[PDB]
Assembly symmetry: C3
Homo-oligomer: 115 residues x 3
């Protein structure tokens, strides 16, 4: 899933914005076997675009989603930023970074639109 | 999920349209554990809009849907009505009560 | 799910084109157990329409689906064809058939209706 080097980046990211706990290889194994459970292809965790796709399939369920699902989604958000080379200090910065990413492109959509 | 009173109602409602058996405490718990089985939020059973979001989430998987899914759908349907103080005597009523309130949404929406 | 003649047709189909292995009884059973797990009604498997409805539901998940889902969808693709008396030699022919119908009705109920 992660290059050693992505792993090194991963293992410094904190689970919560000021927390002492950090992401670990066990969180990737979990996320992979979780996706397996929900019949999503865990091989997808190995590229940015994979992760982008998974997040899109899970995005809709977020609202009514239990914290086991939100926990899965967020793990994959952090992974995505890691594959993307987007520097984050914790999970929330991951999610913000992804959002302000979408919001930028969806403007360029509106803006490419009137051409 | 339910206050007593709210739960008093619940416990006289019959599984069937017109059969003898009724709604246990045990069915809410089941409904809760089903939801987290489906990674859906169980705290949603605690509110009417909550049950209203769940039913909306579940409503497309229903036709093709298994007996457990349809069973989960129907008790959350009843939960909803009891929650909504829109009372009823069986599931079928609670279900017509959503088919027929949903139509009041559609006829008054556009 | 299948009737004897359907099951002769079935146990004569292969999983891959010039392939050796064909569809056993074990495949109908797995797919039935798989569907109940997916909270889908296994009794749908014994009709062309139900198989149809299961496939249209599964289809959006396919692209990011695991091999378990991909294999669930393929068995059911084949099962439909059989219920339809469509003469598909392997799974590949099964899935283009599913691909043929799924766009017929997609084009229909959007640009006709």
């Amino acid at each position: 899933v992660l290059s050693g080097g992505e792993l090194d980046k991963w293992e410094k990211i904190r689970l919560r914005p000021g927390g002492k706990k950090q992401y670990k290889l066990k969180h990737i194994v979990w996320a992979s076997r979780e996706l397996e459970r929900f019949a999503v292809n865990p091989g997808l965790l190995e590229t940015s675009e994979g992760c982008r796709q998974i997040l899109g399939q899970l995005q809709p369920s977020l609202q009514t989603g239990s914290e086991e699902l939100r926990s899965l989604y967020n793990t994959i958000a952090v992974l995505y930023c890691v594959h993307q080379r987007i520097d984050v200090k914790d999970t929330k910065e991951a999610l913000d970074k992804i959002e302000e990413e979408q919001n930028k492109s969806k403007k360029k959509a509106q803006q490419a639109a009137a051409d």
